[PDB]
Write a protein that binds this ligand. Structure first.
Ligand SMILES: O=C(N[C@H](C/C=C/c1ccccc1)C(=O)O)c1ccc2ccccc2c1
Length: 113
């Protein structure tokens, strides 16, 4: 484990998310079920090669890191919500997580460093 990792992510918020708004939608109205369905659909297109993670995140992530194509930059432990932190540090660089759940919503994570 390095001191810090660098990750990008794709966040799909839902109406029960901690902050149910985003840069792309004044009010998040989708259900958590719908959010996980979207996340999984994203996972399958990225595995098939039909979509690129970073392009997907720059257009559809509910995180304002969309403008950075998903990049969150480097972080250490104790900074992010623990479920996000644990998944991130468990990835090898170049590896992509499965669905990851935080109070913010549902994420796909790509570790870059
Ligand atoms: O809270 C953020 N985004 C919120 C969404 C939650 C994002 C989030 C990220 C990691 C763990 C838990 C939640 C928003 O935009 O509404 C957030 C956090 C760290 C960032 C670092 C770099 C660039 C953008 C960033 C955006």
């Amino acid at each position: 484990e390095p001191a810090r990792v660098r990750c990008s992510h794709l966040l799909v918020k839902h109406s029960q998310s901690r902050r149910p708004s985003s840069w792309r939608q004044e009010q998040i109205t989708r259900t958590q079920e719908e959010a996980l369905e979207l996340i999984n659909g994203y996972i399958q297109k990225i595995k098939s090669g039909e979509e690129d993670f970073e392009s997907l995140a720059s257009q559809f992530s509910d995180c304002s890191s969309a403008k950075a194509r998903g990049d969150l930059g480097a972080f250490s432990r104790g900074q992010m919500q623990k479920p996000f932190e644990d998944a991130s540090f468990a990835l090898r660089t170049g590896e992509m997580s499965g669905p990851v759940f935080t109070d913010s919503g549902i994420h796909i994570i790509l570790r870059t460093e």
